[PDB]
From Swiss-Prot, chain A:
This is 26S proteasome regulatory subunit RPN5. N-acetylated by NAT1. The lineage of its organism: Eukaryota, Fungi, Dikarya, Ascomycota, Saccharomycotina. Belongs to the proteasome subunit p55 family. Acts as a regulatory subunit of the 26S proteasome which is involved in the ATP-dependent degradation of ubiquitinated proteins. The keyword Phosphoprotein does not apply. Residues 86-260 form the PCI domain. GO terms for cellular component: COP9 signalosome; cytoplasm; proteasome complex; proteasome regulatory particle, lid subcomplex; proteasome storage granule. Keywords: Acetylation, Proteasome. Coiled coil: none annotated. It comes from Saccharomyces cerevisiae (strain ATCC 204508 / S288c) (Baker's yeast). Present with 5710 molecules/cell in log phase SD medium. One of its GO terms (biological process) is protein deneddylation.
Swiss-Prot record, chain B:
Keywords: Acetylation, Phosphoprotein, Proteasome. GO terms for cellular component: proteasome complex; proteasome regulatory particle, lid subcomplex; proteasome storage granule. The gene is RPN8. This is 26S proteasome regulatory subunit RPN8. Present with 19800 molecules/cell in log phase SD medium. Residues 1-92 form the MPN domain. It comes from the Eukaryota. GO terms for biological process: proteasome-mediated ubiquitin-dependent protein catabolic process; ubiquitin-dependent protein catabolic process. Belongs to the peptidase M67A family. Acts as a regulatory subunit of the 26S proteasome which is involved in the ATP-dependent degradation of ubiquitinated proteins. Coiled coil: none annotated. N-acetylated by NAT1. Disulfide bonds: none annotated.
Swiss-Prot record, chain C:
One of its GO terms (biological process) is proteasome assembly. Present with 12400 molecules/cell in log phase SD medium. One of its GO terms (cellular component) is proteasome storage granule. Acts as a regulatory subunit of the 26S proteasome which is involved in the ATP-dependent degradation of ubiquitinated proteins. Keywords: Proteasome. Belongs to the proteasome subunit S11 family. This is 26S proteasome regulatory subunit RPN9. Residues 182-350 form the PCI domain.
């Protein structure tokens, strides 16, 4: 490891554990697999590390002794997912660190763990599953004893409009200056990803709110030019979040959900019923006023 | 079951009611069926009173629920229900009004058991004027239903006049209800209407 | 006896406040303790700012606690500790009385057959939370408050006094944090449930009216501007100079006149750093108020942006934001055609309905009443043969 034969050393420990499991303790088989996983990050074979993790389960961390190992495992799985750039997964491993009995009780120890969650949850694509996860976070009071994390997360739990050159500037001397969020190295190339998140969140808002809008107007909002804006709507119609139709000459982009004849009329039946309940209760309070005066 | 109650003619604030009587009545009826407990007291109407508020508070001792005041009208007025129902509830209000005891209307419905309903059907044999049966009968209901609404709306119009010139009280519950009517009002000449015509051709 | 302790307070006060103490002692001798309650009340109104109030009451707890009315004693104790500048001391007295009832109602309830000590207990708990809000341990105060709130709603019929004190603690918390919105609703309950035998002074009340007006101006979901002006508190105080201009800001929003608003703001934003750090909230509010007003009063519910642009003195870029915000906050709901250039609103939030609006509401109703009646004659006419 110290030598240049670091690369040979990874292949050695790795091959071994396929056959061997011995008459070893629980604590030792896991101890060897954690070691093996690290080596394969260093060697740069991330796929090998993926194979390695699944031999032990997460039914072998229920015991309090194995918490030091539970934590080391949950930390490792993060570095793996970070390389393949799937942030949904990263946050969920970190969520379980926070849910650790050890981590939770100590003041100092919840602070970075929670902070780290917030950054990778937002960076995940914005879908239906995203919705329920970022609002669980929002409800916690640990987060409200901080203000730095709270300002970023708050933006995507509302369904307001927001614009990239503004969001970029706000957090530039806060969290772009904290590494393992934005502005690190690999994280310098994730500051560039933050752009996509803002747009894809905006399109949710805009579809619901505008039933019809000009495209020429749309490219301002998202802070894009025409080429970018069409691509991002097309992908997003396929994903199932929104349903839309986009016109290529440079006319109008209509966001809509299909509504049949029968459906529109059903709403119109319910209006009518509800109006007649309104009028009956009104007659009762008039009768009632005669008693008052 | 009846309680002996003698109600005065000099005032409405003066009444005799036997507390000792109520328990004896309850324990005998407990023997019959033991799912019966005090849930209020009936007034024979004809109309609501504010001396009933003081009586409500007395029945609140017995109850483990909030007393139902069931104005059972004995005058059979109106073609609809002869029951309006109310429960005494406590509120503050936006006016500057403290600790108010006041009665909020409850919608009235009727249900009957299987044995009870078929008792009615044995007694009566009438076809009713509010039934929705054959072509003729529904033709009658349709005209009757419409004229029903017409009567209630006309009252509202003359009630509005009576706030604003004859100084009846202004109340946010009454105004608030009318706002809702206007906001959820249907509209024609919309694409909703064009579709209604199309549905109309199919029928 | 008590005469000797009492004498010291009599020396220090005014000569004209000297006779008042002699009457308190006159009743004590005679053993009329209803009459002593009444006599005690008087001193407290015009001199709770004295430390003589404090003294007086301490001697009274010791020699009277089942003698004068129980309720009068605990109400005094709320007043007393507002006058004590010591908090450590405050905690000590609250806990002595609280402990004293627990043993006492075992004997007390059975022997008389009645008189509940749990009414005192709530009045006591209110003052403990109040003390932690004045020491500015805000985590502690809040958590006693959630527990207390569960407890009040359990008790079936709440005396106005208890719930009044609760609502005071709730007000004090929310303007320290400067959540304008949370404060507004809680103070509407405070002004309502207000006790007839005063304990919230005129002086206190005028600063509360002010606090409310600031909250309404700088908020973002307050549009009940008129209700405050129709409430006795403000009906009566419109006659003092520092209570001209503040209200004029609130009324500028109600009628939505931007000419009046821009000029007053120039002056007062300079004066008051609260309007200045919350400037952005303040600028938004007139334009939102305007949006919701125009749809509601009109029988149409589609408006061209041109009309909206002219009213709010905005470009088309900002009508589009304003409309979007109304939808987020939930003050209007609707959809936007930027291709027809309309905003078709489809729902309006119910709000306060004033003299002018009732007339507008009323006319709409006459038209539909007459419409059914005309229509009904034809339906009488047609299908004459059968009405069976």
């Amino acid at each position: 490891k110290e030598e240049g034969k670091i690369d040979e050393a990874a292949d050695i420990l790795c091959e071994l554990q396929v056959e061997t499991y011995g008459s070893m303790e629980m604590s030792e088989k896991i101890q060897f697999i954690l070691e093996q996983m690290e080596l394969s990050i260093l060697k740069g074979d991330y796929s090998q590390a993926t194979v390695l993790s699944r031999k032990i389960l997460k039914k072998t961390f229920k015991n309090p002794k194995y918490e030091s190992l539970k934590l080391e495992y949950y930390n490792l799985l993060v570095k793996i997912s970070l390389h393949k750039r799937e942030y949904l997964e990263v946050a969920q491993y970190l969520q379980e660190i926070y849910q650790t009995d050890a981590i939770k009780s100590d003041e100092a120890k919840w602070k970075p763990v929670l902070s780290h969650i917030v950054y990778f949850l937002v960076l995940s694509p914005y879908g239906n599953l995203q919705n329920d996860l970022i609002h669980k976070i929002q409800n916690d009071n640990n987060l409200k004893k901080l203000e730095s994390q709270e300002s970023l997360v708050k933006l995507f739990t509302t369904n307001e409009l927001m614009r990239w050159p503004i969001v970029q500037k706000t957090y530039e001397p806060v969290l772009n200056e904290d590494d393992l969020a934005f502005g690190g190295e690999a994280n310098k190339h994730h500051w560039e990803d933050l752009q996509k998140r803002v747009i894809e969140h905006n399109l949710r808002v805009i579809s619901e709110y505008y039933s019809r809008i000009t495209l020429l107007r749309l490219n301002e909002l998202l802070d894009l030019t025409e080429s970018q804006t069409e691509t991002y709507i097309s992908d997003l119609v396929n994903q199932g979040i929104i349903y839309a139709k986009v016109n290529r000459p440079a006319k109008i982009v209509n966001f809509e959900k299909p509504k049949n004849s029968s459906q529109l009329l059903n709403e119109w039946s319910h209006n009518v019923d509800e109006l007649l309940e309104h009028i009956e209760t009104i007659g009762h309070l008039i009768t009632k006023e005669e008693i008052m005066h | 079951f009846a309680l002996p109650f003698e109600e005065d003619e000099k005032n409405s604030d003066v009444w005799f009611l036997d507390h000792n009587y109520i328990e004896n009545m309850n324990e005998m009826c407990k023997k019959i069926n033991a799912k019966e407990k005090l849930i209020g007291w009936y007034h024979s109407g004809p109309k609501l009173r504010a001396s009933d508020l003081k009586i409500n508070e007395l029945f609140k001792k017995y109850t483990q629920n909030n007393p139902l005041l069931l104005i059972v009208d004995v005058k059979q007025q109106g073609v609809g229900l002869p029951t309006d129902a109310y429960v005494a509830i406590e509120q503050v209000k936006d006016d500057g009004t403290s600790t108010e005891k006041t009665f909020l209307h409850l919608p009235c419905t009727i249900e009957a058991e299987e044995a009870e309903e078929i008792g009615v059907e044995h007694l009566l044999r009438d076809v009713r004027d509010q039934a929705a049966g054959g072509l003729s009968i529904r033709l009658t209901n349709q005209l009757k239903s419409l004229k029903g609404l017409q009567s209630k709306l006309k009252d509202v119009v003359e009630y509005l006049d009576k706030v604003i010139n004859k100084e009846l009280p202004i109340n946010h519950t009454i105004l608030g209800k009318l706002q809702d009517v206007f906001n959820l009002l249907p509209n024609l000449g919309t694409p909703d209407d064009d579709e209604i015509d199309v549905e109309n051709h199919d029928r | 006896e008590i005469d000797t302790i009492l004498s010291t307070l009599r020396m220090e006060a005014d000569p004209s406040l000297h006779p008042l103490f002699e009457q308190f002692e006159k009743f004590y001798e005679e053993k009329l303790w209803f009459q002593l309650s009444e006599s005690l009340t008087k001193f407290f109104d015009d001199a709770k700012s004295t430390p003589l109030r404090l003294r007086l009451y301490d001697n009274f707890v010791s020699k009277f606690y089942d003698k004068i009315n129980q309720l009068s004693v605990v109400k005094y104790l709320l007043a007393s500790l507002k006058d004590s500048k010591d908090f450590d001391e405050s905690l000590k007295y609250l806990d002595d009385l609280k402990a004293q009832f627990q043993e006492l109602d075992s004997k007390k309830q059975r022997n008389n057959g009645s008189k509940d000590h749990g009414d005192g207990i709530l009045l006591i708990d209110s003052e403990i939370a109040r003390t932690y809000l004045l020491k500015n341990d805000l985590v502690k105060a809040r958590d006693l408050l959630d527990d207390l709130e569960k407890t009040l709603d359990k008790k079936d019929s709440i005396p106005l006094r208890i719930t009044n004190s609760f609502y005071s603690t709730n007000s004090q918390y929310f303007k320290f944090k400067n959540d304008f919105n949370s404060f507004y609703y809680t103070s509407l309950l405070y002004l309502s449930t207000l006790e007839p035998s005063t304990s919230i002074t005129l002086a206190e009340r005028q600063q509360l009216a002010y606090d409310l007006s600031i909250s309404a101006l700088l908020g973002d979901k307050i549009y009940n501007f008129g209700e405050l002006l129709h409430h006795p508190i403000m009906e009566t105080i419109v006659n003092d100079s520092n209570y001209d201009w503040l209200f004029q800001l609130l009324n500028a929003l109600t009628v939505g006149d931007f000419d009046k608003f821009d000029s007053l703001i120039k002056v007062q934003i300079s004066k008051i750093p609260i309007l200045a750090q919350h400037e952005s909230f303040l600028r938004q509010k007139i334009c939102l108020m305007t949006l919701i007003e125009t749809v509601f009063v009109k029988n149409i519910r589609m408006l061209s942006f041109e009309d909206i642009s002219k009213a709010t003195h905005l470009p088309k870029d900002n009508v589009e934001h304003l409309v979007m915000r109304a939808i987020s906050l939930g003050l209007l709901k609707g959809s936007i055609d930027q291709v027809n250039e309309l905003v078709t609103i489809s729902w309006v939030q119910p709000r306060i309905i004033s003299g002018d609006q009732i007339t507008k509401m009323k006319d709409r109703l006459v038209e539909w009443n007459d419409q059914v009646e005309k229509l009904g004659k034809k339906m009488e006419a047609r299908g004459q043969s059968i009405w069976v």
